[PDB]
Paper text:
Here, we present an independent structure determination of Cgl1109 at ∼3 Å resolution without use of the previous Rosetta model and molecular-replacement solution. The diffraction data for the Cgl1109 crystal structure were quite anisotropic and the effective overall B factors along the principal axes of the unit cell ranged from 60 to 110 Å2. The relatively high anisotropy and high B factors made the structure determination considerably more challenging than for many other structures at a similar resolution of about 3 Å. For Cgl1109, DEN refinement resulted in a model that is closer to the true structure, producing improved model phases that in turn provide a better starting point for automated model building. The improved model phases also provided more significant peaks in anomalous difference Fourier maps to better locate the six selenium sites of the protein. There were several regions that required correction of register shifts and rebuilding of α-­helices that were not corrected even in the second round of DEN refinement and automated model building. The final refinement employed residues 10–369 of Cgl1109 (a 369-residue protein) and other solvent molecules (one phosphate ion and one chloride ion). It was performed against diffraction data collected at the high-energy remote wavelength. c maps initially suggested the possible presence of two zinc ions in the putative catalytic site, which would be expected owing to the addition of 6 mM ZnCl2 during cocrystallization (which was added based on putative functional annotation and ligand screening in a fluorescence-based thermal shift assay). However, we did not model zinc ions in the final model owing to the uncertainty associated with high B factors and the absence of significant peaks in the anomalous difference Fourier maps, including from diffraction data collected at the zinc absorption edge.
C. glutamicum is a Gram-positive bacterium that finds industrial use in the production of vitamins and amino acids, including glutamic acid, which is used in the production of the flavoring agent monosodium glutamate. DapE is involved in producing l-lysine and l,l-2,6-diaminopimelate and its catalytic mechanism is likely to involve two zinc ions. The crystal structure of Cgl1109 reveals a dimeric structure from crystal-packing considerations and as also suggested by the PDBePISA server. The dimeric assembly is promoted by the smaller of the two domains of the molecule, while the larger domain is the putative catalytic domain.
Numbering used by the authors:
A (entry chain A), B (entry chain A): 10 to 369
Write the structure that this text describes.
């Protein structure tokens, strides 16, 4: 592992197969590439298949550099080979590029006297699987102190752009109960499916709330994504359920997001209707209006920064009270596509931006 | 085959296995039991596995006696054995009782000088299967003249009661089309499922119309019986469909029933929504207020006659412009139950009622 060059490290990390669960090797290499390379003041920490590292140069602000080392199950995309200006392979866009960059820059500026911000580097595992294996997850649960920082940056592929923060994510399953009866004697029973009619109506009528933050504009989303009901053409259904997916702006927290959905749809009070949260997640504030961030906005340009409507591990930091942004290489597409295309150029563009940000 | 006794014929017809498609034998026996028994003026007609027979004694009114000779697939219910006042077996309640009765009475009164009404007897096949194999169906299609009568009686199990007419049956499949999009960017797409919200609301708000006929009261039914939509928790569904089941009073015909549903739910005009009829069927008027029926009402009692909310082949006659009633033996339950229980008594009760009706 070089760490002396950005593009080489990428093609090096990509050629090391790391589909979720088997990040063992790529993790071990990164640890040893940092240890055998004896950077003074730099602390290396091995936690499962996560690799943490931090400097303690006193210093005012602190920047977090995080990225996942795992990939989606490989599909004839390894090893990698560069084809005239562009690198094809697996992971070239999903982190392994940004990861190479986040690693490279930390290896260099850790001992550079012109480092304006303390650095933490977290290369974590199992991002591509249920939130009970997530590397950042266990870290937050056992060693939260390591997450501490004044700004967090996630290597997620953004094509050199800054996709600031992320929106909260809430999935609720609304279930209506009735009683079976022959569809010709409907009155003898109670149509469960019809009970969702009022709740459905409010959802289809709901106009998503919208909020401005740091010059950015986040828009919410409330949609029915699953609706299943029925047992026979001549039987009044006694059971009907839905899946509501609520995407809330980073100015809300789960408890608020939940309370908003439950109040607006009147999930409590409606007889025969039960609801429950199947998945919840916090949003992420970009905090662009802070000095800790000033430099980075400049090294990228105010007109290359949009809001992230999706959800990334960026929230795990914002939960800790840490502003976070998505900043990586490769087009957001080719994400899990069986032909990840990453313009070899963006690798150096990003690495350049980071130095300008962390040196001014 | 006796035809000299009602209860014997029943236990005889039951012991002859006739699950849909194999009514061959039971059909052949009935034909030959009528032919070799040379009733003068009586015409016997063999059509597929249906057995028709009619008298032509001039006479004013004419009564139709119809019943299906087939059963639901047998399930350890044959042969049959009577257990102290009650007969257990397969078909003992689903027609084979009424069929025995309808046969018996036709064999007797066909040459009796005290027969007030001309008689047609139709013992048809494949009632227990899609309406493209139905015996009465093909008869109506090729030899409608045989269905001609002033009153029709179906041997369906009603436990000696008269279940008058039947309600129409309409199933429409409403389908909404949208466009896929990430549930966090819902605005980029169009939620198909939300498009059914207005139509669903009208259905859940619709109060079924209700009509009185001949002292009887029919109530309609409009219910969603199937609702399926969704492709992923993070994907705006582009496709959503429903199954509406409309049960209309016998004062409406299919074209009216359809037009009522389509107007009330505004199925035309709503953009992105297509609808289609999957199944339709006419209702059946009881016509109890007619002289042709006078006798039968008396031989049963005005307080043993209720309205049939379901649907029976009784409609196939009412379509021909012929009032029709459901009058059979055995409890309406035990219908397709793996233990058909028919009180051996009701066999003679019904046969008695019929004579009193057809002799006065
Ligand atoms: Cl996004
Ligand atoms: Cl009924």
């Amino acid at each position: 592992d070089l760490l002396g060059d950005p593009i080489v490290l990428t093609q090096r990390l990509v050629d090391i197969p790391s589909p979720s669960g088997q990040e063992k090797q790529i993790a071990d290499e990164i640890e040893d590439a940092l240890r055998n390379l004896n950077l003074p003041g730099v602390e290396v920490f091995r936690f499962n298949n996560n690799v943490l590292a931090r400097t303690n140069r006193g210093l005012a602000s602190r920047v977090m550099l995080a990225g996942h080392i795992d990939t989606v199950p490989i599909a004839d995309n390894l090893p990698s080979r560069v084809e005239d200006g562009i690198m094809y392979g697996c992971g070239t866009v999903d982190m392994k590029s940004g990861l190479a960059v986040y690693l490279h820059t930390f290896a260099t500026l850790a001992t550079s006297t012109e480092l304006k911000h303390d650095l933490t580097l977290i290369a974590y595992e199992c991002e591509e699987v249920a939130d009970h294996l997530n590397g950042l997850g266990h870290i937050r649960d056992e060693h939260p102190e390591w997450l501490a920082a004044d700004l967090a940056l996630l290597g997620e592929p953004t094509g050199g752009w800054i996709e600031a923060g992320c929106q909260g994510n809430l999935r609720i399953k609304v279930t209506a109960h009735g009683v079976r009866a022959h569809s010709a004697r409907s009155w003898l029973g109670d149509n469960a499916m019809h009970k969702l009619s009022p709740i459905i109506s409010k959802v289809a009528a709901y106009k998503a709330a919208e909020v401005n933050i740091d010059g950015l504009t986040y828009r919410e989303g409330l949609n029915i994504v699953f609706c299943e009901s029925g047992v026979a053409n001549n039987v009044i259904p006694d059971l009907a359920w839905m899946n509501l997916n609520f995407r809330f702006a980073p100015n809300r927290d789960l408890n608020e997001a939940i309370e908003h959905v439950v109040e607006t749809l009147e999930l409590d009070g409606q007889d025969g209707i039960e609801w429950a949260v199947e998945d919840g997640a916090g949003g992420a504030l970009p905090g662009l209006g802070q000095q800790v961030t000033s430099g980075l906005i400049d090294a990228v340009g105010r007109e290359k920064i949009r809001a992230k409507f999706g959800w990334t591990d960026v929230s795990r930091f914002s939960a800790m009270g840490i502003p976070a942004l998505n900043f990586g290489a490769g087009d957001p597409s080719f994400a899990h596509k069986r032909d990840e295309q990453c313009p070899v150029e963006q690798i150096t563009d990003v690495a350049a931006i980071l130095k300008q940000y962390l040196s001014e």
